[PDB]
A paper describes a structure:
In addition, the de novo approach of the experiment allowed us to observe the formation of a likely off-pathway promoter complex. While the repositioning of the σ-finger in RP-σ3.2dis likely contributes to the observed instability of the T-strand, this T-strand instability may also be an intrinsic feature of the promoter itself. We observe a very noisy density near the RNAP active site of RP-σ3.2dis, consistent with the presence of unstably bound ~ 2nt RNA. In light of the absence of steric clash between the 5ʹ RNA and the σ-finger in RP-σ3.2dis and noisy RNA density, suggesting RNA-DNA hybrid instability, we reason that RP-σ3.2dis is unlikely to serve as a target for MtbGreA’s stimulation of promoter escape. Prior findings in Eco have shown that RPitcs with short 2–3nt RNA are not susceptible to GreA-stimulated cleavage.
In bacteria, the core enzyme (subunit composition α2ββ‘ω) catalyzes all templated RNA synthesis. Promoter-specific initiation is directed by a dissociable promoter-specificity subunit, the σ factor, which must bind to core, forming the holoenzyme (holo). Here, we present seven distinct intermediates showing the structural details of [name] RNA polymerase initial transcribing complexes and promoter escape, using a de novo cryo-electron microscopy approach.
Numbering used by the authors:
A (entry chain C): 444 to 1129
B (entry chain F): 438 to 527
C (entry chain D): 437 to 781
D (entry chain D): 832 to 1014, 1023 to 1090, 1097 to 1176
E (entry chain D): 1227 to 1275
F (entry chain E): 27 to 109
G (entry chain B): 1 to 234
H (entry chain A): 2 to 226
The structure:
């Protein structure tokens, strides 16, 4: 997603040439020294074996010319908070003394209470008087990174689940619709115009003309400029990178304005996921232990549906026996499978392919090998010739299907830059519309995550009193023990942002809404809102907004002041005896889909020096039956199964053909022999 | 991470043995000594083909009769009953 | 079921490719092995009906790295499942230490008669209930299921349709002749599941004291009838357990279910334990849906006294800071004093 | 941190309180990550050591065994079930017939010491039971079946052939991740590591050598406390032992003139297994090892039957050292 | 662990392995002497009654 | 003994099978050897009759040989001697 | 349109009145759609009769124990509720039970006036001792479902009459459970399994047939708006 | 004994949405009745929708048309919201030609006999001077959500963009019961069901079709002896 593009840059890595490696990495380097505040985010680090070695710059951080990390601060002199913003590295942060942005400035730069939250040199926190404060933080959320600043209600989340949310906010895939979130922060807009994947009007003017391919803008002084789009360009991880315009033929644009959304952008701001109707009940054990059920509604209307573009390549090089050719003259295959290929090899654009189909007809010479006698007899029986050439065509790998967008073919005949001994290169782009399914990984913004347990139909889903079914159903038992109740708050405000509120300030303003900003005492349905990170919706303000949540179409306040609703069991029919929390939660689709993970092998390729099966799912590949599983099978007393798994499925070179033959003919599995691992060990020892 | 093209792929061996048995069966369903002349001509038991001189030497006959026998036996195996259980192997 | 497991058919077809090849050669669907292999690769729809045949009663192994202890590998009977994700039984999640974040499992396939017998007898799921370490059950219902059984068996005083012995104007109106009548009264809005009633049970074994009172020595249950002042929930829990087990009549805390399943595994055969555990799973999920366990910010109540509390400990913290400032104690002593102060708070 | 955080996650933390919380969060995550590798190495070593412990014979017909507590006495004459009986005594074959004040043999040699058995034993009034176990099993290569007792999974006598050693190693290695650390006594997974590795503890606490009153040689910043021998012949003059750590208390703290035991721990901490072996024999060192491992595992609320640690310790104490060659082949 | 030193001093001692543990029986691929591998269960004669 | 009827891979119940032999390992080898015997009875049926017999109990429509062997075990139709 | 596969209906008879019906393969997910309606219709539509109130002599305000019987009022009440009696009258007919002397009273001891028949032969309803006397006037009226004890049907006018609960339903316990059934390669069709337990008044097969009749009439009342509408014909 | 068979009174609210009221019923039955009717209406009401489109200038789904502001996949998403009711079961086709600037509404589609488009005011795409959009759509009848039928399974002529079809004229169904439940035990339920269809067929016809489906399925259970 564009956010991952932004966050791969602005990343600080402590490992590499000239730096400590992970085995040389101690525990004391991986902590958060109190000098990280405002210079490096303590939340967002990779969760694997790199925690603390890889982090990212803060939002406001700037780099000292000598390679240090400066940080802005508001200077306060004699107690009047000035606006002279000065940049300090960590040393001057030690020397001086630092206050807090969420402090009562009395509209004059003057503090209110003398006794003030303040940081000293060694990370100490005390209560200095409001006279020794010389420096003040520029704002809250200064300590935080870019990706983590896009989590609403972050201050309610625990640091572990906030870390998870920040690390999985960068794994969302670009959907086909990319609807903007209801509740968010102020970093949804500026993390997209800066990520680069949003076309920005360079200079102001009026739109001359628009299309799906280009935008011609008319500048105020004569000149015109054509912004080209990037339609269906493959990303570096197989996802789509569409860019469609959001401007019309008569609109006037200003410099710095979003003129075309990107992969995960909606009218200018970031949109990594969709707003889904969420209930928090445990339903029939399908949402058991972080599992998530969805409605079929998300499958029917393509709510969560990504366009994945895969790139296949094949080169016609040179060889000792001669040169290969990309042609239609392939050895033995029926002309049924040559229908999709065009007249000179590669497939026709748009022809749907399945696993094992032919993409690039490419055949190589083989030479002269004496045939087996029965091959000679069978060839002469049908009169077919030797066909000295041998086919190695580009077959699309197993477990893959989809259309063919574009074919990009190089050649030596056009004098293109090709490596030595290569005659013709060709790449085929095969794309598929991966829908949502049971097993794909879903997640919100607060570290919740789960494989989809079951896609229910729309009728067997708990629907509200108005007949609107909920879209997904999370589990309750994952909420309290993970200390990430922000997802609850984001849920409640989400509903408040969907139904729209109206604080009836008839007799003054209510007590909770006294310090609310204006044009927030009433809101429209589907009105976008934003809570900044460390100054957002107060809990009392959430209660007040939830109290008045004006009805949908009839006189019907579906969600009471508590934030729950009376759901009807769509399967059985009876209403649920207790009210259930419902709301609108913003949830992404992570890039851990099943089709990338499902894997199987009965027989396939084999390794080189040892005769073990290969692995990695790039080939057929097999799973490592490691040492711990050997111990587990020894503890059961399982002797013959262990003998099998270590002899006749991995290394018995003469025994694997025997077991395949014995299975096919229906005989008994042959007795294992000595493995080809012990024999290699024996020869090395000798 | 390097495969081994020079390796038993474990379907070729069993398929090849099944082809052997089926070809032997279809050869047995053919005529007597003429299917065996085909067997010698393509070397299904000796491992080497040998020529019309050798087939005549072991049988006491000429070479044109051998070629006529080859053509006659060859015509029948193109007919589907013999080919249907053999075609899929090629 | 406990011994069963899901298996994506698009993956089972590749695991069982030689078996299905042989079988659909045998059923004359292919002329030979090569046409059968091509038919398998093109996945003609008759390859699925034969795949069901070649899979039945043929266990597979489910490894999960890291395999910490002996139960990390278990043998399940596979079944075909729409989709591409392995469907795991929820009760082996404690053994595998497998939550559902995207955790992956590897399916292995035993081949020989010896290996199939070892998977079927030694490493089957329903034969491995207890831990190898301490003998406590790992097929015990946990998490969601414990909440369901707790809500099922808890007792609420002052609920709808209780037993009261008030008379003079009207009879007791708490007595129910059979659990079927109680279930009827629960489907109507009369009887709550967690109300204290008196039911006449004829298919459940009473506890030891009541059995020794009413019958003494040899009260056999399938015919005998006896009264019990219990909740409808505890009855509905107790017909899940086998006939020979006595009535429980308790509130199903997790340790209570641990003790019950320990006794059940110690005294009864393993198949009975597996079936009882499956029944407990079904009831636990069904009544955890109805328990109404949700999380809202109106649910999380703050203590009303908290501010007075924080003031009463802030004054002592301020006193400690002042005593450090004036100088009777060093830095470490005031740190220790503040630490103890805030632990008390 | 002495501030401290004063906001709940419902009220929402401030900036500094959240920044303070991040310290502990990241520390815990990294500590867990390293603890995985520590547990893995412990499991591998225990698997190697306990590999050749497999049940070979149904019964060795031995009579030696351990003594187990089984609900010690209260001042009111009431038997209180010992806090760890479901792990120490439960499911272990009784070797000597328990007799209660010449009442009867409540359970005979050959029972499994099950739950109803334990209820009967507690009703009878007997506490100390002699049970057969794998430290005392008199087989040659691999433990017998009646000494291992009950296989914890099956519920019956362990089948002839089961590899109880790998089961023991995995059962001690799996809860190495649930087990945590703390705050100079080591009190976590490294403590178990230094126990099974048989290393002198970093907080070494030398124990007594003979009974008698104590000759309290307290020094400055260290304690060289001597022990007057009851009947011995010389008082064991100890040396500089850091006074920062306290003294082991019993009966009161270690006070001048108090009567110590043969192997009473003088100061407060952990003893090394080598000295307690050399002083009090293999029986006492086996009891010490089992008790000290189970103290760590009980502190984290992990149920492990002692027979697994018992298999490991039996594997520890196999060999002997040669101090005199005699005249045959031994260096 | 410590493969070099163990290997070289075993080579000096000419120490003959006897192949009777659960690891050396896994390395060489023959049936391990535990569970269903021991001669008590590996050599069962099964005839119809 | 009032268990509900088993289904699939658990028929017959293993607890009733274990009463016939000493340990589950003996059951494993028992059933493995008997299933092998049944398999090569099915293989050696086309040619002349040899010393192998079985299945003594009537199998199903299509039934794996190991299931037949274990069902024969439960029906008390075999005997054995250990090593 | 076509159903594309015709569902069946086959029963397993377990006891005299205990059945396990299986319907396969229902078009997904029609299993629940018809199963819940069937379960509720069986328990709450089939007409039947049971005792709705009883008056005993010797019990006027202290409904604790009846003179001459071993049991108490609650035990007599719950034994009388389990009694199965058919009926042919909308009005609340009055059964008369009267037995004097020692011994137990059988369910057949009550005299049935014409029509109303006591299907249960001899169920123990009281244990008269000390040469006791027992005289219950039972009130039997037909009905459906499980109407709870009608509290103060009158203004407590017949104080001797104690309103008891009423198991009108001939069937006593229906549990529905759907499963998964393979069709071609779909492996998702719904197989419905019903476990139905009735009393010895009617067979479970006839109860299922009558409930199907009532449900098809109700959904025909739904249908009869536009008869010529297309949908799924089996 | 309560003996009055229920009624099915009707109440029109808008052109597409209406309420039905069924009374009196047996107690503890209105919820199951409403759920049965909802699960039938929301899943198995036969309808018609577009299944495949063929635009002239495109070879597949992931490309662009010269002149249109939109691209092909968003045209797919826009046409997926169309509502159309056929009369005959053959896979009928309709056409759409548009040249020059302007918004392309659903009313620009010229349908053959039988089929009709029930919302001409739908935005499909917008063109310019260089814009030229020609597309043929294939409407067939069906029920439920069928996924995209693969081109290879079909006639496999390159250019036939397959589209997911959702044959469900119903749009939103709810209900609520008003159980009187008086102390005199003359209790009865009162089912107030609500149907909102997406302007393809009137709610009366949808409920009639659901009722006939239920009648046909319950004649199975009724017809025994
Ligand atoms: Mg996990
Ligand atoms: Zn022993």
């Amino acid at each position: 997603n564009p956010l991952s593009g932004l966050t791969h840059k602005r990343r600080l890595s402590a490992l590499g040439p000239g730096g400590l490696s992970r085995e040389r990495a101690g525990l004391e380097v991986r902590d958060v020294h109190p000098s990280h505040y405002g210079r490096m985010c303590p939340i967002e680090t990779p969760e694997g074996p790199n925690i603390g070695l890889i982090g990212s710059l803060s939002v406001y951080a700037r780099v000292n010319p000598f390679g240090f990390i400066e940080t802005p601060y508001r200077k306060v002199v004699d107690g009047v908070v000035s606006d002279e913003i000065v940049y300090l590295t960590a040393d001057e942060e030690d020397r001086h003394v630092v206050a807090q942005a969420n402090s009562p400035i009395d509209a004059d730069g003057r503090f209110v209470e003398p006794r003030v939250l303040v940081r000293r040199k060694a990370g100490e926190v005390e209560y200095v008087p409001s006279s020794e404060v010389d420096y003040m933080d520029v704002s809250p959320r200064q300590m935080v990174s870019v990706a983590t600043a896009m989590i609403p209600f972050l201050e309610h989340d625990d640091a572990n689940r906030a870390l998870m949310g920040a690390n999985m906010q960068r794994q969302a895939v670009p959907l086909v619709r990319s609807e903007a979130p209801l509740v968010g922060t102020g970093m949804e807009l500026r993390a997209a115009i800066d990520a680069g994947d949003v076309v920005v009007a360079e200079e102001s003017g009026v739109i001359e003309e628009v299309s799906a391919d280009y935008i011609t803008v008319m500048h105020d002084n004569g000149t015109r400029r054509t912004y080209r789009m990037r339609k269906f360009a493959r990303s570096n991880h197989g996802t789509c990178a569409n860019q469609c315009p959001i401007v019309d033929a008569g609109d006037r644009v200003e410099a710095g304005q979003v003129i075309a959304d990107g992969p995960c952008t909606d009218d200018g701001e970031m949109a990594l996921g969709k707003n889904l109707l969420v209930a928090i009940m445990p339903w029939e054990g399908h949402n058991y232990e972080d599992a998530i059920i969805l409605s079929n509604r998300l499958v029917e209307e393509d709510v969560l549906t990504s366009i994945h573009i895969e790139e296949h390549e094949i080169d016609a090089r040179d060889t000792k026996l001669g040169a290969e050719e990309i042609t239609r003259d392939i050895p033995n295959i029926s002309d049924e499978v040559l229908a999709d290929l065009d007249e000179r090899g590669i497939v026709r654009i748009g022809a749907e392919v399945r696993d094992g189909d032919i993409l690039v007809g490419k055949v190589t010479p083989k030479g002269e090998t004496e045939l087996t006698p029965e091959e000679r007899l069978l060839r002469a029986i049908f009169g077919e010739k030797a066909r000295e050439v041998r086919d190695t065509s580009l077959k699309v790998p197993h477990g893959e299907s989809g259309k063919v967008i574009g074919i990009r073919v190089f050649s030596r005949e056009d004098e293109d830059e090709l490596p030595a001994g290569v005659n013709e290169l060709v790449r085929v782009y095969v794309a598929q519309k991966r829908k949502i399914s049971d097993g794909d990984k879903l997640a919100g913004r607060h570290g919740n995550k789960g494989v989809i347990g079951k896609i229910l139909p729309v009728e067997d889903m708990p629907f509200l009193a108005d007949g609107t079914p909920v879209d997904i159903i999370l589990n309750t038992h994952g909420v309290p023990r993970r200390m990430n109740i922000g997802q609850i708050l984001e849920t409640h405000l989400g509903w408040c942002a969907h139904s729209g509120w109206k604080v009836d300030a008839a007799k003054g303003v209510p007590d909770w809404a006294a310090r609310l900003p204006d044009e927030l005492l009433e809101a429209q349905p589907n009105a976008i809102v934003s809570t900044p990170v460390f100054d957002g919706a107060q809990e009392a303000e959430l209660q007040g907004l939830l109290s008045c949540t004006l009805p949908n179409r009839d006189g019907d306040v579906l969600v009471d002041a508590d934030g729950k609703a009376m759901l009807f069991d769509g399967r059985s029919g009876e209403p649920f005896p207790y009210p259930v929390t419902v709301g609108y939660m913003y949830i992404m689709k992570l890039h851990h889909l099943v089709d990338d993970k499902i894997h199987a092998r009965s027989t396939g390729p084999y390794s080189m020096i040892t005769q073990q099966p290969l692995g990695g799912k790039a080939q057929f590949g097999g799973q490592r039956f490691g040492e711990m599983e050997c111990w587990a099978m020894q503890a059961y007393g399982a002797a013959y199964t262990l003998q099998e798994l270590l002899t006749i499925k991995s290394d018995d070179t003469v025994g694997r053909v025997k077991v395949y033959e014995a299975i096919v003919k229906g005989e008994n599995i042959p007795e294992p022999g000595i493995p080809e691992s012990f024999k290699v060990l024996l020869k090395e020892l000798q | 991470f390097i495969e081994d093209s020079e390796a038993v792929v474990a379907v070729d061996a069993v398929s090849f043995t099944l082809l052997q048995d089926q070809l032997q069966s279809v050869l047995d369903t053919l005529s007597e000594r003429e299917a065996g002349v085909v067997r010698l001509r393509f070397g299904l038991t000796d491992g080497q083909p040998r020529t019309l001189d050798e087939i005549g030497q072991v049988y006491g006959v000429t070479r044109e009769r051998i070629r006529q026998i080859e053509s006659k036996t060859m015509s029948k195996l193109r007919h589907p009953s013999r080919s249907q259980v053999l075609r899929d192997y090629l | 079921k406990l011994h069963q497991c899901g298996l994506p058919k698009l993956m089972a077809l590749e695991l069982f490719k030689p078996f299905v090849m042989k079988r659909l050669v045998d059923l004359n669907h292919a002329q030979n092995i090569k046409s059968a292999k091509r038919m398998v690769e093109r996945q003609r729809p008759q390859v699925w009906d034969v795949l069901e045949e070649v899979i039945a009663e043929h266990p597979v192994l489910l490894n999960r790295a890291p395999t910490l202890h002996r139960l990390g590998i278990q043998a399940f009977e596979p079944m075909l499942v729409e989709g591409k994700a392995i469907q795991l039984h929820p009760l082996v999640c404690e053994a595998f230490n497998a939550d559902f974040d995207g955790d992956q499992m590897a399916v292995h396939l035993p081949l020989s008669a010896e290996a199939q017998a070892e998977a079927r007898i030694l490493m089957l799921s329903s034969n491995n209930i207890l831990s190898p370490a301490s003998g406590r059950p790992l097929a015990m219902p946990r998490l969601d299921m414990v909440t369901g059984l707790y809500y099922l068996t808890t007792e609420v005083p002052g609920d709808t349709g209780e037993y009261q012995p008030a008379s003079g104007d009207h009879p007791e109106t708490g007595v129910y002749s059979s659990p079927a009548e109680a279930i009827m009264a629960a489907d109507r809005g009369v009887l709550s599941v967690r109300a204290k009633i008196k039911v006449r049970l004829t298919q459940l074994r009473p506890p030891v004291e009541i059995e020794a009172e009413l019958f003494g020595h040899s009260g056999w249950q399938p015919g005998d009838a006896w009264m019990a002042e219990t909740t409808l929930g505890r009855v509905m829990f107790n017909e899940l357990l086998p006939l020979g087990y006595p009535f429980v009549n308790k509130q199903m805390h997790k340790k209570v279910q641990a003790a019950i399943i320990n006794d059940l595994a110690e005294r009864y055969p393993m198949i009975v334990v597996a079936q009882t555990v499956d029944k407990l799973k079904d009831a636990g999920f069904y009544w955890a849906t109805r328990s109404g366990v949700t999380v809202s910010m109106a649910d999380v109540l703050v203590p009303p006294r908290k501010k007075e509390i924080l003031d009463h400990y802030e004054e002592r913290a301020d006193k400690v800071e002042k005593q450090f400032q004036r100088g009777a104690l060093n830095h470490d002593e005031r740190n220790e004093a503040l630490v103890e102060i805030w632990k008390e708070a | 941190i002495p501030r401290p955080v004063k906001s709940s996650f419902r009220e929402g933390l401030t900036v500094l309180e959240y920044f303070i919380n991040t310290h502990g969060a990241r520390k815990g995550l990294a500590d867990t990550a390293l603890r995985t590798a520590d547990s893995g190495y412990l499991t591998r070593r225990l698997v190697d050591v306990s590999q050749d412990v497999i049940v070979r014979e149904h019964d060795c017909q031995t009579e030696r065994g351990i003594v187990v507590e089984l609900a010690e006495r209260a001042p009111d004459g009431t038997l209180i079930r010992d806090p760890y009986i479901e792990t120490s005594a439960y499911a272990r074959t009784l070797g000597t017939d328990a007799v209660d004040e010449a009442g009867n043999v409540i359970v005979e040699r050959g029972q499994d010491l099950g739950d109803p058995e334990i209820d009967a034993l507690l009703a009878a009034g007997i506490t100390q039971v002699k049970v057969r176990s794998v430290l005392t099993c008199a087989t040659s290569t691999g433990v017998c079946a009646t000494c291992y007792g009950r296989s914890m999974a099956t519920g019956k006598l362990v089948d002839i052939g089961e590899a109880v050693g790998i089961v023991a190693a995995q059962s001690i290695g799996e809860p190495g991740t649930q087990l945590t650390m703390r705050t100079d006594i080591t009190g976590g997974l490294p403590r178990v590591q230094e126990l099974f590795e048989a290393r002198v503890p970093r907080g070494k606490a030398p124990i007594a050598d003979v009974t008698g009153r104590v000759r309290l040689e307290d020094g400055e910043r260290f304690y060289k406390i001597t022990i007057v021998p009851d009947d011995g012949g010389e008082e064991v003059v100890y040396d500089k032992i850091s006074k920062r750590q306290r003294l082991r208390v019993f009966k009161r703290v270690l006070s001048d003139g108090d009567h110590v035991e043969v192997g009473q721990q003088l100061m407060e901490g952990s003893a090394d297994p080598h000295e307690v072996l050399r002083v009090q024999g293999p029986r006492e060192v086996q009891i010490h090892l089992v008790r000290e491992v189970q103290e760590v595992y009980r502190a984290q609320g992990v149920s492990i039957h002692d027979k697994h640690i018992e298999v490991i310790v039996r594997q520890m104490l196999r060999r002997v050292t040669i101090i005199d060659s005699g005249s045959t082949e031994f260096l | 662990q410590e493969t070099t030193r163990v290997l070289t001093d075993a080579a000096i001692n000419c120490r003959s392995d006897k192949l009777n543990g659960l690891k050396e029986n896994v390395i060489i691929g023959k049936l391990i002497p535990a569970g269903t591998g021991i001669n008590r269960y590996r050599n069962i004669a099964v005839q119809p009654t | 003994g009032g268990y509900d009827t088993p289904l699939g891979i658990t028929n017959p119940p293993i607890d009733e099978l274990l009463d016939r032999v000493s340990s589950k390992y003996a059951l494993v080898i028992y059933a493995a050897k008997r299933a092998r015997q049944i398999n090569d009875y099915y293989n050696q049926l086309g040619e002349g009759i040899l010393e192998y017999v079985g299945p003594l109990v009537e199998p199903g429509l299509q039934e794996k040989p190991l299931s037949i062997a274990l069902r024969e075990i439960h029906a008390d139709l075999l005997e054995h001697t250990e090593g | 349109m076509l159903i594309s596969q015709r569902p069946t209906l086959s029963e397993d008879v377990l006891t005299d009145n205990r059945s396990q019906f299986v319907i396969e393969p229902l078009e997904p997910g029609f299993g629940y759609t018809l199963g819940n309606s069937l379960r509720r219709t069986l328990l709450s539509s089939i007409p039947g009769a049971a005792v709705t109130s009883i008056r005993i002599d010797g019990v006027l305000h202290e409904f604790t124990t009846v003179p001459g019987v071993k049991e108490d009022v609650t035990e007599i009440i719950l034994n009388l509720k389990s009694l199965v009696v058919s009926s042919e009258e909308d009005e609340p007919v009055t059964m008369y039970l009267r037995k004097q002397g020692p011994g137990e009273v059988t369910a057949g001891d009550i005299v049935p006036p014409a029509g109303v028949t006591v299907h249960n032969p001899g169920m123990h309803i009281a244990t008269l001792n000390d040469k006791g006397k027992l005289e219950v006037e039972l009130v039997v009226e037909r009905g459906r479902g499980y109407v709870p004890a009608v509290q103060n049907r009158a203004s407590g006018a017949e104080i001797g009459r104690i309103p008891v609960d009423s198991i009108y339903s001939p069937v006593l316990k229906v549990t529905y459970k759907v499963d998964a059934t393979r069709v071609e390669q779909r492996t998702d069709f719904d197989k419905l399994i019903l476990d139905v337990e009735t009393k010895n008044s009617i067979s479970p097969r006839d109860a299922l047939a009558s409930a199907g009749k009532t449900l098809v009439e109700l959904f025909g009342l739904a249908r009869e708006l536009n008869v010529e509408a297309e949908g799924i014909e089996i």
